[PDB]
Amino acid sequence: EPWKRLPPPTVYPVKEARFEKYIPPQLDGRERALAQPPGQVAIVIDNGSHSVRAGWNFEDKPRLAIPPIMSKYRDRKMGKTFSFAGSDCYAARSHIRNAFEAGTGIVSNWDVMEHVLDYVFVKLGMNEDMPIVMTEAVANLPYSRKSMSEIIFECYGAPSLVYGIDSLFSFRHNQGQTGLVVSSSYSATHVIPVYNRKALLSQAIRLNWGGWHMAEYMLKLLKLKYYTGFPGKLNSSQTEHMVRDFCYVSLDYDRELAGYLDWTGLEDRERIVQYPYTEEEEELARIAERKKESGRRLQEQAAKMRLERLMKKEQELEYYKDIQRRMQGESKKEIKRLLDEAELKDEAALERVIRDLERSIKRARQQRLLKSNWEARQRAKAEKEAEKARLAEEARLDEERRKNDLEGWLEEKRQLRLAKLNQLKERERLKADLGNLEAAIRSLENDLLRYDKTFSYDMTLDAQRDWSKSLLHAFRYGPRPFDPSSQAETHRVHLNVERIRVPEVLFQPAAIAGVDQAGLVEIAGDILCQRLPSLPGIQDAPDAFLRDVFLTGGNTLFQNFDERLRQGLMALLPVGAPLRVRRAQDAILDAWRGAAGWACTEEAKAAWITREEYLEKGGEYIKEHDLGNA
Amino acid sequence: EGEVTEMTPEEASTLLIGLKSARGQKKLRLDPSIYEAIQKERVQVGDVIYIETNT
Amino acid sequence: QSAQAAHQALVEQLDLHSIHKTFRNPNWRPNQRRNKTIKAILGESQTNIESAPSLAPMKHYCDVTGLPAPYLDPKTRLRYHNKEIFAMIRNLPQGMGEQFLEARGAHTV
């Protein structure tokens, strides 16, 4: 059997957002910053909903990368307040709040945002004056721009601030002259057309699906898969690591999906994630004796009721035979009068009752009464012994039938098996409503198994009911048997179809998760084919953009994401179009690197807003520039 | 041979038919008479059609 | 116990509340109800117009297993792959069909 042949399963421990070590204030960064030439130093903050990434413009990578979360609480034992603002929170008490509105790119809890920024400036080593470059959501809300500016200029007093878009910084860092920028991030997916290094933000589109939504959706699907119960505490922080580690984009979803749960090869399509389970004769002899006596008592009680039914049925039988002894040679009125004493109405009803009692009985001062009761048991024993005689010789006759008419005898077993299955079907398909054989079926199928070379176990009724012929076992537990007793085989989830079903929401949002928005290929194709050729200032559209479709943000890092997008776009473009899909180098940090390289250029310093310009114009005002919002 | 993407009139009668395959799209200017052949076949947008453009 | 003392020592080392932020302006204080939701912020409009719908026909998937679904149940309104999953779907507990709809973001309440 396959589960006996298959190797032991390979299993992956659950991963979650966890603290690992402290990091001190990085005073060498402050030292290096004070050493830079005038107007060539800035603090660069990539304000990401998954990670805030921060560092110095003159360095090649962030010094900090922390979730935009705070935890603040009063210790009920020690009696003092504690406060935390990143991965310093163990994501020990997880009183967590998040700066962003859940599943969106917009900051809305400004108290968390200040705590996150306090942690940033502390760990960058600021103690008392530095220009700030901060990334911003596409089409970011003016109220959030205002609130962020107020914090930067009036809480922290910074000399100058500029906002730009993480998608576009990533593009310019990778030599983006002109192209279609495709960003899938934690919060969102965007397609932005970029022309002559300037983004055409009036033509940008947002999907409202991203790496957060995939973690939440993977969580819903797992809580549905194991809806009858799962012992581990399923958190979307865990399903995020499952989506990172195990999910991939299909190159032909319907053909890969339709075969995914087929038992052959599911061993290699499944992946198994295991939660931290706990491993759990005089005693037994005495208890078993008490059980054995209790069972014996139940057996005696059944036999005592059976013996009461034996004596009752034999006494009933004797009475009905006493009628028959009269009825033979007596009138219909005597027949009717004796039947009326039974309140029966037919001699053959007495025959049926006489036989049916015998058919039941065969299965199962004082001395004259006691022995005549024992003689009713001897009348029962005569039915019981005649039953024994009947069965022994009838079986020997059938053994001759097997020897003498083997093929017809096999053909009989088929005809009987079907007829018995028909009665079971006539029972069950009806009783499935009307409720509001089996050993005979087996015995027939057993001889068919024994000697009918046309028969197989796969047609056995039990095989129709077997777990390894089911689909939901493959879905929930894969190629291998399952028992709830094993603490190691409980506490594990089998990902199966969700390996591919979760990434495919980007391509099929309404069909898979009901998002009611166009898929990624349809968004990009609407821009390339319908919009940009209509926009009158543009030249060489679409073709100039097709030469660089560019992938950015962590939620693009799925395997086959590029080739899926290429093959999807290839069918929407005219034949021989020079379509190139390209990945960013290091598609997460690369948006910060773009902001850092841009930070002190003349283009950036023309776009900087000073504290005094902020006091003049207010916090909604922005210098419009290639990499930022209008 | 492709999925019909477009069937647009371009004459007072000449169509443009757009055809699509998994590997790209092409547009064909149709002679008024092969257009009627395509119209006698019950072709619509989203149908898959075969055309011998020479014959 | 030393483990608990070391744990509190680590939590004390991690604590921001013990730190005076010398770079903060001590004078400025926010409006304590600045934390408006996106819904509330858009309520000030009386540019997040970047969302897009679709008109292509929608493929049908099984609500239980995600496999392709030929069938839509009249009763539960769940889509399902085969007779085995139809048997499951009509044997669901009293609130569970609505949870399968909620993964599509469908509701009947």
Ligand SMILES: Nc1ncnc2c1ncn2[C@@H]1O[C@H](COP(=O)(O)OP(=O)(O)OP(=O)(O)O)[C@@H](O)[C@H]1O
């Ligand atoms: N190798 C990977 N494969 C797939 N997904 C990944 C991988 N690494 C990270 N992710 C996911 O991608 C997302 C990270 O996106 P990214 O950090 O680029 O965005 P962000 O700047 O935090 O977000 P936003 O711009 O929406 O505010 C998370 O959902 C993360 O789980």
Ligand SMILES: [Mg+2]
């Ligand atoms: Mg981002």
